[model samples]
Target chain A: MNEYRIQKLYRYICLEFKNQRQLIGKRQEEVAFDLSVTAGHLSRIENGKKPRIALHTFLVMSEYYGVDFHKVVKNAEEKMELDEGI
Target chain B: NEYRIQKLYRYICLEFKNQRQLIGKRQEEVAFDLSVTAGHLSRIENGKKPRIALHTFLVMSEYYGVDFHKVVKNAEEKMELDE
Candidate 1:
């Protein structure tokens, strides 16, 4: 996959996590704990340093965000396409 | 953790075996297709790597014709039971 796709995916993930935290009023540590990953790893994932996240962790995050994994991916893909067209 | 690990191990082995059989491909060949090393794939199959990256899992799911969401749901259920 291209870095552009990867960057788009990361941006989506970061936004989802941010929105989830704001909705739930939870800290990053608490969210990371619930998602079964270290806070540092979560930061790395958000910052695009870690390009891949565990499937289980993605599942947990999707559930926490009240969204489907496929839906999130599809949204990211669409957003990336739009950005590319711009 | 033990129960969770065993459950995942079983699932991974079953998926890998079924896919390999259906495609009639060796582990190394499949691993190459997935952009992972054969040794890494072997470790995952052998339960050395219990958790796989989402990207890798997506590649594997597409290649193996496995239902990615279903697999994630099953794993979530197992994790719930474990907790």
Candidate 2:
């Protein structure tokens, strides 16, 4: 149960970034090179195979993607709570 | 106001320091206990260092008795208030 929540959190984050990147007409490979990480790593992150993100990376991605981290966290927490209840 | 992860961590690190002092453990002693470098710990607390891995966050949470949920809730509230 505990592990599920953590993965879900990152899954939410990853998917959000994926959507934002595509919304801006950017490719995963391009973003990966820009962020100085491998394309495979970026692919795994977006595809949910990797769910780990440090705050620094999260902040950088937020800046790169033009998303609000605070809103994301708040929304994530609310969704997770709903999942718990269901 | 613009909210960022840096500010959230700033709140977290601030509370971390507060709880450590309240627990009455010296910085050096806590670093020794956690096997973290005192310089890194100091840098984290003072906002000089901005990144921390999950392992470090969990270790600090365990040592400081700070609740992760509370930290998020409070940090968000603080950011909202700042705006």
Candidate 3:
């Protein structure tokens, strides 16, 4: 299921964002406010409920959290190789 | 002006849907598989929405057998002509 794999990648993205936010000691509300997106939208996205964000939107959040979106995307690197070998 | 960026994004979504049609896929069926209502998908492609969610955008490209970079590139080029 292609959708299934994408969702898995999405789950990883949410986890990485959460980790960065906590490490930086900023409240989710603060991040939401700074980004000018609603707290509910941010919260749902972060928790994988929404799991829908624009790349630019995600990049902005990455910048705020001091995380690089590329790196987060690349973590699925091994997953592809694993797929190739199958 | 954010107008440039907005135009680029909207144009990309427009092409995303256009690419789907090029492959002989119906919007109504595609929307179902993509987990969105057909009306919503049409609205996004019609540029009624400012931007699309990254997930839907990516999957549409994937299903349509087009690269996301190419989609954006074509839109950017088209936008440059107007601006």
Q: Per-prediction fnat values?
A: 0.35, 0.26, 0.26
Model 1, runs deviating above 4 Å: A1-11, A19-44, A47-49, B1-24, B33-35, B42-48, B58-83
True contacts kept of 2: 0.26
Alpha carbon lDDT of each predicted model: 0.60, 0.65, 0.67
Superposed Cα deviation of residue A51, candidate 2 (Å): 4.8
lDDT by residue for model 2 (B1-74), tens: 12566676677666667667788888888888777788878777666666565335445755665544455556
- Cα lDDT of model 3 by residue, B1-83, tens digit: 24544555677777876787777878798888777889988898887876456776657766775544466666767767766
**Candidate 2 per-residue lDDT over residues A41-80, each given as its tens digit:** 9888766565345666666786777776655555555665
Tell me the deviation in Å of residue A72 in model 3: 12
Residues A1-86, model 3: lDDT tens digits: 26765566565566567767888898888988987878887888777676666655655676666654545545433444365431
DockQ scores of all models, one per candidate: 0.24, 0.27, 0.21
Candidate 3 wrongly placed segments (more than 4 Å): A8-50, A55-86
lDDT of 3 at B21: 75
Candidate numbers, best DockQ first, in rank order: 2, 1, 3
Task: Report residue A1 deviation for candidate 1 (angstroms).
Answer: 6.2
Give me the runs in candidate 2 sitting further than 4 Å from their true place: A1-3, A82-86, B1-12, B15-49, B54-83
Decreasing lDDT order of the candidates: 3, 2, 1
